[PDB]
mmCIF file of all heavy atoms in Angstrom:
data_model
loop_
_atom_site.group_PDB
_atom_site.id
_atom_site.type_symbol
_atom_site.label_atom_id
_atom_site.label_comp_id
_atom_site.label_asym_id
_atom_site.label_seq_id
_atom_site.Cartn_x
_atom_site.Cartn_y
_atom_site.Cartn_z
ATOM 1 N N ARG I 245 0.819 -1.207 0.000
ATOM 2 C CA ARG I 245 0.000 0.000 0.000
ATOM 3 C C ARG I 245 0.855 1.260 0.000
ATOM 4 O O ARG I 245 0.458 2.276 -0.581
ATOM 5 C CB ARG I 245 -0.940 0.004 1.206
ATOM 6 C CG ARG I 245 -1.712 1.304 1.367
ATOM 7 C CD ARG I 245 -2.730 1.230 2.488
ATOM 8 N NE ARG I 245 -3.477 2.478 2.615
ATOM 9 C CZ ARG I 245 -4.422 2.700 3.524
ATOM 10 N NH1 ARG I 245 -4.745 1.758 4.401
ATOM 11 N NH2 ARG I 245 -5.045 3.870 3.556
ATOM 12 N N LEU I 246 2.022 1.224 0.646
ATOM 13 C CA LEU I 246 2.853 2.421 0.717
ATOM 14 C C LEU I 246 3.498 2.721 -0.631
ATOM 15 O O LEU I 246 3.550 3.880 -1.057
ATOM 16 C CB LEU I 246 3.916 2.263 1.803
ATOM 17 C CG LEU I 246 3.384 2.328 3.238
ATOM 18 C CD1 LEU I 246 4.434 1.852 4.227
ATOM 19 C CD2 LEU I 246 2.929 3.744 3.582
ATOM 20 N N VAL I 247 3.988 1.688 -1.318
ATOM 21 C CA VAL I 247 4.542 1.883 -2.654
ATOM 22 C C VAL I 247 3.472 2.427 -3.592
ATOM 23 O O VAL I 247 3.749 3.273 -4.453
ATOM 24 C CB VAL I 247 5.141 0.561 -3.175
ATOM 25 C CG1 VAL I 247 5.506 0.662 -4.652
ATOM 26 C CG2 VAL I 247 6.352 0.166 -2.348
ATOM 27 N N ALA I 248 2.233 1.954 -3.440
ATOM 28 C CA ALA I 248 1.156 2.383 -4.327
ATOM 29 C C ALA I 248 0.694 3.802 -4.024
ATOM 30 O O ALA I 248 0.240 4.507 -4.932
ATOM 31 C CB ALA I 248 -0.024 1.416 -4.225
ATOM 32 N N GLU I 249 0.788 4.237 -2.766
ATOM 33 C CA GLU I 249 0.289 5.548 -2.367
ATOM 34 C C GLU I 249 1.368 6.620 -2.294
ATOM 35 O O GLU I 249 1.030 7.803 -2.180
ATOM 36 C CB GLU I 249 -0.397 5.466 -0.996
ATOM 37 C CG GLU I 249 -1.709 4.704 -0.977
ATOM 38 C CD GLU I 249 -2.459 4.882 0.331
ATOM 39 O OE1 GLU I 249 -1.872 5.435 1.287
ATOM 40 O OE2 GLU I 249 -3.635 4.469 0.405
ATOM 41 N N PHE I 250 2.646 6.253 -2.360
ATOM 42 C CA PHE I 250 3.718 7.209 -2.135
ATOM 43 C C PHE I 250 4.867 6.938 -3.092
ATOM 44 O O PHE I 250 4.994 5.848 -3.655
ATOM 45 C CB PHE I 250 4.230 7.152 -0.689
ATOM 46 C CG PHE I 250 3.179 7.461 0.337
ATOM 47 C CD1 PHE I 250 2.606 6.445 1.087
ATOM 48 C CD2 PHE I 250 2.771 8.764 0.562
ATOM 49 C CE1 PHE I 250 1.642 6.724 2.035
ATOM 50 C CE2 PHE I 250 1.804 9.049 1.508
ATOM 51 C CZ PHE I 250 1.239 8.028 2.246
ATOM 52 N N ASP I 251 5.713 7.954 -3.260
ATOM 53 C CA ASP I 251 6.906 7.843 -4.089
ATOM 54 C C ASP I 251 8.048 7.240 -3.284
ATOM 55 O O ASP I 251 9.176 7.743 -3.310
ATOM 56 C CB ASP I 251 7.305 9.216 -4.632
ATOM 57 C CG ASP I 251 6.180 9.890 -5.393
ATOM 58 O OD1 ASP I 251 5.812 9.396 -6.479
ATOM 59 O OD2 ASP I 251 5.661 10.914 -4.898
ATOM 60 N N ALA I 252 7.759 6.157 -2.569
ATOM 61 C CA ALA I 252 8.751 5.435 -1.793
ATOM 62 C C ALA I 252 8.797 3.990 -2.265
ATOM 63 O O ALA I 252 7.837 3.464 -2.835
ATOM 64 C CB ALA I 252 8.438 5.484 -0.293
ATOM 65 N N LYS I 253 9.935 3.356 -2.025
ATOM 66 C CA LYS I 253 10.135 1.958 -2.357
ATOM 67 C C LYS I 253 10.109 1.124 -1.085
ATOM 68 O O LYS I 253 10.526 1.578 -0.015
ATOM 69 C CB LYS I 253 11.446 1.773 -3.120
ATOM 70 C CG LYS I 253 11.516 2.678 -4.337
ATOM 71 C CD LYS I 253 12.746 2.443 -5.175
ATOM 72 C CE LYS I 253 12.670 3.241 -6.461
ATOM 73 N NZ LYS I 253 11.662 2.658 -7.390
ATOM 74 N N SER I 254 9.587 -0.091 -1.210
ATOM 75 C CA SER I 254 9.465 -0.977 -0.065
ATOM 76 C C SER I 254 10.830 -1.503 0.364
ATOM 77 O O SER I 254 11.754 -1.636 -0.442
ATOM 78 C CB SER I 254 8.539 -2.147 -0.393
ATOM 79 O OG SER I 254 8.651 -3.170 0.581
ATOM 80 N N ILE I 255 10.950 -1.783 1.663
ATOM 81 C CA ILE I 255 12.130 -2.462 2.194
ATOM 82 C C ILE I 255 12.116 -3.960 1.924
ATOM 83 O O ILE I 255 13.120 -4.633 2.189
ATOM 84 C CB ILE I 255 12.232 -2.171 3.706
ATOM 85 C CG1 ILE I 255 13.566 -2.648 4.292
ATOM 86 C CG2 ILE I 255 11.063 -2.804 4.462
ATOM 87 C CD1 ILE I 255 14.782 -1.964 3.717
ATOM 88 N N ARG I 256 11.021 -4.498 1.386
ATOM 89 C CA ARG I 256 10.826 -5.939 1.290
ATOM 90 C C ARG I 256 11.284 -6.506 -0.050
ATOM 91 O O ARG I 256 11.058 -5.913 -1.109
ATOM 92 C CB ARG I 256 9.354 -6.299 1.504
ATOM 93 C CG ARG I 256 8.856 -6.109 2.933
ATOM 94 C CD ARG I 256 7.399 -6.542 3.075
ATOM 95 N NE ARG I 256 7.246 -7.992 2.937
ATOM 96 C CZ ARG I 256 7.203 -8.855 3.950
ATOM 97 N NH1 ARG I 256 7.287 -8.439 5.209
ATOM 98 N NH2 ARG I 256 7.070 -10.152 3.703
ATOM 99 N N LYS I 257 11.921 -7.677 0.020
ATOM 100 C CA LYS I 257 12.252 -8.459 -1.170
ATOM 101 C C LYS I 257 11.024 -8.717 -2.033
ATOM 102 O O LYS I 257 11.079 -8.605 -3.263
ATOM 103 C CB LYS I 257 12.836 -9.802 -0.734
ATOM 104 C CG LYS I 257 14.136 -9.746 0.037
ATOM 105 C CD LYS I 257 14.474 -11.139 0.552
ATOM 106 C CE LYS I 257 15.893 -11.564 0.249
ATOM 107 N NZ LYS I 257 16.879 -10.856 1.107
ATOM 108 N N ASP I 258 9.914 -9.095 -1.401
ATOM 109 C CA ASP I 258 8.738 -9.612 -2.086
ATOM 110 C C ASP I 258 7.725 -8.528 -2.435
ATOM 111 O O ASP I 258 6.550 -8.840 -2.661
ATOM 112 C CB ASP I 258 8.078 -10.697 -1.230
ATOM 113 C CG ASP I 258 7.693 -10.197 0.150
ATOM 114 O OD1 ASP I 258 7.724 -8.968 0.371
ATOM 115 O OD2 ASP I 258 7.360 -11.033 1.016
ATOM 116 N N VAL I 259 8.146 -7.270 -2.480
ATOM 117 C CA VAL I 259 7.290 -6.164 -2.890
ATOM 118 C C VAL I 259 7.968 -5.468 -4.057
ATOM 119 O O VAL I 259 9.163 -5.157 -3.992
ATOM 120 C CB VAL I 259 7.027 -5.178 -1.736
ATOM 121 C CG1 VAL I 259 6.196 -3.994 -2.215
ATOM 122 C CG2 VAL I 259 6.331 -5.884 -0.587
ATOM 123 N N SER I 260 7.209 -5.217 -5.115
ATOM 124 C CA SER I 260 7.785 -4.691 -6.338
ATOM 125 C C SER I 260 7.812 -3.172 -6.288
ATOM 126 O O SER I 260 7.092 -2.534 -5.516
ATOM 127 C CB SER I 260 6.983 -5.151 -7.556
ATOM 128 O OG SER I 260 5.739 -4.476 -7.618
ATOM 129 N N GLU I 261 8.670 -2.596 -7.122
ATOM 130 C CA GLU I 261 8.766 -1.149 -7.230
ATOM 131 C C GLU I 261 7.691 -0.570 -8.135
ATOM 132 O O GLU I 261 7.620 0.655 -8.282
ATOM 133 C CB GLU I 261 10.147 -0.755 -7.754
ATOM 134 C CG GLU I 261 11.295 -1.247 -6.889
ATOM 135 C CD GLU I 261 12.652 -0.813 -7.411
ATOM 136 O OE1 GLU I 261 12.819 0.387 -7.717
ATOM 137 O OE2 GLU I 261 13.550 -1.673 -7.522
ATOM 138 N N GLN I 262 6.863 -1.412 -8.748
ATOM 139 C CA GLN I 262 5.856 -0.916 -9.670
ATOM 140 C C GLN I 262 4.829 -0.093 -8.902
ATOM 141 O O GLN I 262 4.428 -0.450 -7.790
ATOM 142 C CB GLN I 262 5.156 -2.072 -10.383
ATOM 143 C CG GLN I 262 4.631 -1.723 -11.774
ATOM 144 C CD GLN I 262 3.343 -0.931 -11.778
ATOM 145 O OE1 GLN I 262 2.549 -0.987 -10.837
ATOM 146 N NE2 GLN I 262 3.133 -0.171 -12.850
ATOM 147 N N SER I 263 4.391 1.003 -9.507
ATOM 148 C CA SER I 263 3.404 1.889 -8.907
ATOM 149 C C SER I 263 2.958 2.875 -9.970
ATOM 150 O O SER I 263 3.738 3.247 -10.851
ATOM 151 C CB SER I 263 3.964 2.645 -7.693
ATOM 152 O OG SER I 263 5.078 3.442 -8.051
ATOM 153 N N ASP I 264 1.706 3.285 -9.886
ATOM 154 C CA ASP I 264 1.188 4.174 -10.916
ATOM 155 C C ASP I 264 1.835 5.577 -10.936
ATOM 156 O O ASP I 264 1.291 6.375 -11.721
ATOM 157 C CB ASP I 264 -0.326 4.314 -10.760
ATOM 158 C CG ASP I 264 -1.075 3.029 -11.053
ATOM 159 O OD1 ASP I 264 -0.604 2.231 -11.893
ATOM 160 O OD2 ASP I 264 -2.130 2.806 -10.419
ATOM 161 N N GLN I 265 2.898 5.970 -10.230
ATOM 162 C CA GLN I 265 3.404 7.325 -10.405
ATOM 163 C C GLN I 265 4.740 7.243 -11.134
ATOM 164 O O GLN I 265 5.176 6.167 -11.554
ATOM 165 C CB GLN I 265 2.780 8.250 -9.354
ATOM 166 C CG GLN I 265 1.279 8.427 -9.575
ATOM 167 C CD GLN I 265 0.730 9.639 -8.868
ATOM 168 O OE1 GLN I 265 0.065 10.483 -9.472
ATOM 169 N NE2 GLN I 265 1.015 9.742 -7.580
ATOM 170 N N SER I 266 5.347 8.417 -11.306
ATOM 171 C CA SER I 266 6.768 8.641 -11.549
ATOM 172 C C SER I 266 7.837 8.183 -10.562
ATOM 173 O O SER I 266 7.931 8.723 -9.455
ATOM 174 C CB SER I 266 6.584 10.151 -11.386
ATOM 175 O OG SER I 266 5.490 10.634 -12.152
ATOM 176 N N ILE I 267 8.631 7.178 -10.928
ATOM 177 C CA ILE I 267 9.650 6.647 -10.023
ATOM 178 C C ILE I 267 10.689 5.926 -10.878
ATOM 179 O O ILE I 267 10.323 5.138 -11.756
ATOM 180 C CB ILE I 267 9.035 5.693 -8.976
ATOM 181 C CG1 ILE I 267 10.079 5.254 -7.940
ATOM 182 C CG2 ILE I 267 8.375 4.484 -9.649
ATOM 183 C CD1 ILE I 267 10.598 6.382 -7.052
ATOM 184 N N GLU I 268 11.979 6.165 -10.636
ATOM 185 C CA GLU I 268 13.004 5.306 -11.220
ATOM 186 C C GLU I 268 13.198 4.044 -10.382
ATOM 187 O O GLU I 268 12.961 4.031 -9.173
ATOM 188 C CB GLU I 268 14.336 6.051 -11.360
ATOM 189 C CG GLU I 268 15.401 5.301 -12.173
ATOM 190 C CD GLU I 268 14.945 4.944 -13.576
ATOM 191 O OE1 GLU I 268 14.995 5.821 -14.463
ATOM 192 O OE2 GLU I 268 14.537 3.779 -13.789
ATOM 193 N N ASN I 269 13.657 2.975 -11.034
ATOM 194 C CA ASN I 269 13.947 1.745 -10.312
ATOM 195 C C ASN I 269 15.327 1.832 -9.678
ATOM 196 O O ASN I 269 16.258 2.399 -10.256
ATOM 197 C CB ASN I 269 13.891 0.529 -11.239
ATOM 198 C CG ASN I 269 12.550 0.369 -11.925
ATOM 199 O OD1 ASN I 269 11.515 0.236 -11.272
ATOM 200 N ND2 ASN I 269 12.565 0.348 -13.252
ATOM 201 N N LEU I 270 15.455 1.251 -8.483
ATOM 202 C CA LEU I 270 16.713 1.332 -7.749
ATOM 203 C C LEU I 270 17.888 0.907 -8.615
ATOM 204 O O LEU I 270 18.967 1.507 -8.551
ATOM 205 C CB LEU I 270 16.648 0.473 -6.484
ATOM 206 C CG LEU I 270 15.990 1.079 -5.243
ATOM 207 C CD1 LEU I 270 16.072 0.098 -4.083
ATOM 208 C CD2 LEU I 270 16.620 2.411 -4.850
ATOM 209 N N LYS I 271 17.704 -0.134 -9.431
ATOM 210 C CA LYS I 271 18.821 -0.676 -10.192
ATOM 211 C C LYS I 271 19.345 0.314 -11.223
ATOM 212 O O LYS I 271 20.492 0.182 -11.660
ATOM 213 C CB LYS I 271 18.411 -1.980 -10.882
ATOM 214 C CG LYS I 271 17.391 -1.826 -12.001
ATOM 215 C CD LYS I 271 16.879 -3.189 -12.452
ATOM 216 C CE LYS I 271 15.699 -3.077 -13.405
ATOM 217 N NZ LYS I 271 15.175 -4.420 -13.782
ATOM 218 N N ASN I 272 18.542 1.302 -11.611
ATOM 219 C CA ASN I 272 18.963 2.314 -12.569
ATOM 220 C C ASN I 272 19.462 3.587 -11.904
ATOM 221 O O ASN I 272 19.834 4.529 -12.607
ATOM 222 C CB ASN I 272 17.804 2.663 -13.508
ATOM 223 C CG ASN I 272 17.286 1.462 -14.267
ATOM 224 O OD1 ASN I 272 18.043 0.557 -14.614
ATOM 225 N ND2 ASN I 272 15.985 1.446 -14.528
ATOM 226 N N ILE I 273 19.484 3.643 -10.577
ATOM 227 C CA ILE I 273 19.923 4.840 -9.866
ATOM 228 C C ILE I 273 21.405 4.679 -9.545
ATOM 229 O O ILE I 273 21.813 3.616 -9.059
ATOM 230 C CB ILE I 273 19.085 5.068 -8.599
ATOM 231 C CG1 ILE I 273 17.637 5.372 -8.990
ATOM 232 C CG2 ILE I 273 19.663 6.213 -7.772
ATOM 233 C CD1 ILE I 273 16.677 5.470 -7.823
ATOM 234 N N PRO I 274 22.248 5.695 -9.791
ATOM 235 C CA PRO I 274 23.691 5.570 -9.487
ATOM 236 C C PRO I 274 23.995 5.750 -8.001
ATOM 237 O O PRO I 274 24.447 6.793 -7.530
ATOM 238 C CB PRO I 274 24.306 6.685 -10.335
ATOM 239 C CG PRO I 274 23.254 7.730 -10.367
ATOM 240 C CD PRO I 274 21.937 7.000 -10.401
ATOM 241 N N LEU I 275 23.744 4.697 -7.230
ATOM 242 C CA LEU I 275 23.857 4.792 -5.784
ATOM 243 C C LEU I 275 25.320 4.832 -5.356
ATOM 244 O O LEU I 275 26.203 4.281 -6.019
ATOM 245 C CB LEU I 275 23.153 3.613 -5.115
ATOM 246 C CG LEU I 275 21.644 3.505 -5.343
ATOM 247 C CD1 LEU I 275 21.108 2.222 -4.723
ATOM 248 C CD2 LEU I 275 20.908 4.714 -4.780
ATOM 249 N N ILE I 276 25.568 5.491 -4.229
ATOM 250 C CA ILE I 276 26.935 5.578 -3.703
ATOM 251 C C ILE I 276 27.436 4.172 -3.398
ATOM 252 O O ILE I 276 26.717 3.391 -2.743
ATOM 253 C CB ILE I 276 26.973 6.454 -2.440
ATOM 254 C CG1 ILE I 276 26.433 7.857 -2.741
ATOM 255 C CG2 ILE I 276 28.402 6.531 -1.891
ATOM 256 C CD1 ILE I 276 26.243 8.723 -1.513
ATOM 257 N N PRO I 277 28.639 3.789 -3.829
ATOM 258 C CA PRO I 277 29.175 2.489 -3.413
ATOM 259 C C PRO I 277 29.148 2.369 -1.898
ATOM 260 O O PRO I 277 29.502 3.299 -1.172
ATOM 261 C CB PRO I 277 30.603 2.496 -3.968
ATOM 262 C CG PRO I 277 30.553 3.433 -5.120
ATOM 263 C CD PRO I 277 29.553 4.492 -4.747
ATOM 264 N N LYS I 278 28.701 1.208 -1.426
ATOM 265 C CA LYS I 278 28.520 1.016 0.007
ATOM 266 C C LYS I 278 29.814 1.286 0.768
ATOM 267 O O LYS I 278 29.792 1.866 1.859
ATOM 268 C CB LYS I 278 27.996 -0.395 0.265
ATOM 269 C CG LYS I 278 26.653 -0.639 -0.435
ATOM 270 C CD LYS I 278 25.479 0.043 0.254
ATOM 271 C CE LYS I 278 24.182 -0.178 -0.527
ATOM 272 N NZ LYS I 278 24.093 0.700 -1.737
ATOM 273 N N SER I 279 30.936 0.867 0.192
ATOM 274 C CA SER I 279 32.239 1.083 0.809
ATOM 275 C C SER I 279 32.617 2.560 0.767
ATOM 276 O O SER I 279 33.765 2.924 1.021
ATOM 277 C CB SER I 279 33.308 0.251 0.099
ATOM 278 O OG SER I 279 33.628 0.806 -1.166
#
């Protein structure tokens, strides 16, 4: 429900990033290397 109602991504493995708004997928975002 939170992914569907907000521009946020779930912390859960089993919840998809799909949602009816504008959002990039995490895998396409240039995230800071963890190290």
